[PDB]
Ligand binder design. Structure first.
Ligand SMILES: O=[N+]([O-])c1ccc2nn[nH]c2c1
Length: 301
């Protein structure tokens, strides 16, 4: 059984990665599969805001430290995130109505996480899910209280905290070139970078239904046209796990020079949030599914 990470490196890419955390690494056969087959790990939950700063200035790094130490011992690259994401905010953040207060809170959260792991993290997802489906900016507490400047502020703060890390904006429903969100993230990233905002990458949080892989072949080149040094596929899963969809996503990555790699949402189907759709690359016995073998064969050829 061949390693997709090794094979994608042989094709000139950086990694094939996976999301995990302490719970997964101590159960099933997740650790053994990650050791063999994946070259980068991301914390699924242990670096989100609610996990790391459940009360203001009272940080909890136990789960994140476990992941980082496991990755270093096993020679894996590490991704971290998401530093600013409305979906994982504790209530103490959402209640803040004062611009200066919230700006300092946000800067402190960013700097504290990034400093702790300085030099050890390849990629940080700095801002997540900042766009509405129509391409307008999502009206989260950060937009409502700080305004549109919160995104530049987050990236400039992140660059200062660890200049080694590649800083990404991420979003979902960027899977079709003509979708309004895809157009808008491309346009705004172009503008931010032209003003000197340090956005190194766009990460596409790719949750596909059956048959949607084909559209990624056109959407990913469009995302790359924003001119960031890197793009990536993140959080990848596919309802039904058809080889056709998975191979299309891999081929999109191969066709886009700036696409550094792909991260899947987990290891085995039963641990998915949509397990009924069996959307991952390993089954409930931890055997590689037809889609895994198809990706291997595509990368070997
Ligand atoms: O690619 N990922 O699986 C992944 C998981 C959780 C994250 N939080 N921020 N960015 C993330 C990427």
């Amino acid at each position: 059984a061949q390693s997709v990470d090794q094979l994608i490196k042989a094709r000139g890419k950086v990694y094939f990665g996976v999301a995990t955390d302490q719970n997964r690494l101590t159960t099933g056969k997740n650790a053994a599969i990650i050791q063999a087959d994946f070259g980068m790990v991301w914390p699924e939950n242990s670096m989100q805001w609610d996990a790391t700063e459940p009360s203001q200035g009272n940080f909890n790094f136990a789960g994140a430290d476990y992941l980082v130490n496991w990755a270093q011992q096993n020679g894996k690259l590490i991704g971290g995130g998401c530093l600013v994401w409305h979906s994982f905010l504790p209530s103490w953040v959402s209640s803040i109505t004062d611009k200066n207060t919230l700006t300092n809170v946000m800067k402190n959260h960013i700097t504290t996480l990034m400093t702790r792991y300085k030099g050890k993290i390849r990629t940080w997802d700095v801002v997540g899910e900042a766009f509405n489906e129509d391409g307008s900016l999502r009206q989260t507490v950060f937009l409502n209280v700080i305004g549109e400047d919160y995104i530049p502020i987050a990236f400039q703060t992140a660059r200062a905290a660890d200049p080694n890390a590649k800083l990404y904006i991420m979003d979902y429903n960027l899977d079709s070139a003509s979708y309004p969100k895809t157009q808008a993230i491309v346009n705004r990233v172009k503008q931010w970078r032209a003003a000197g905002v340090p956005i190194d990458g766009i990460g596409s949080q790719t949750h596909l239904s059956a048959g949607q892989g084909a559209g990624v072949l056109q959407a990913l080149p469009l995302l790359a046209s924003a001119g960031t040094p890197e793009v990536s596929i993140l959080m990848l899963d596919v309802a039904g796990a058809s080889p056709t969809d998975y191979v299309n996503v891999v081929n999109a990555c191969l066709n886009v020079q700036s696409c550094v790699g792909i991260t899947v949402m987990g290891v085995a189907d039963p641990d998915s949030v949509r397990a009924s759709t069996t959307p991952l690359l390993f089954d409930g016995n931890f055997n590689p599914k037809p889609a895994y073998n198809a990706i291997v064969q595509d990368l070997q050829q």
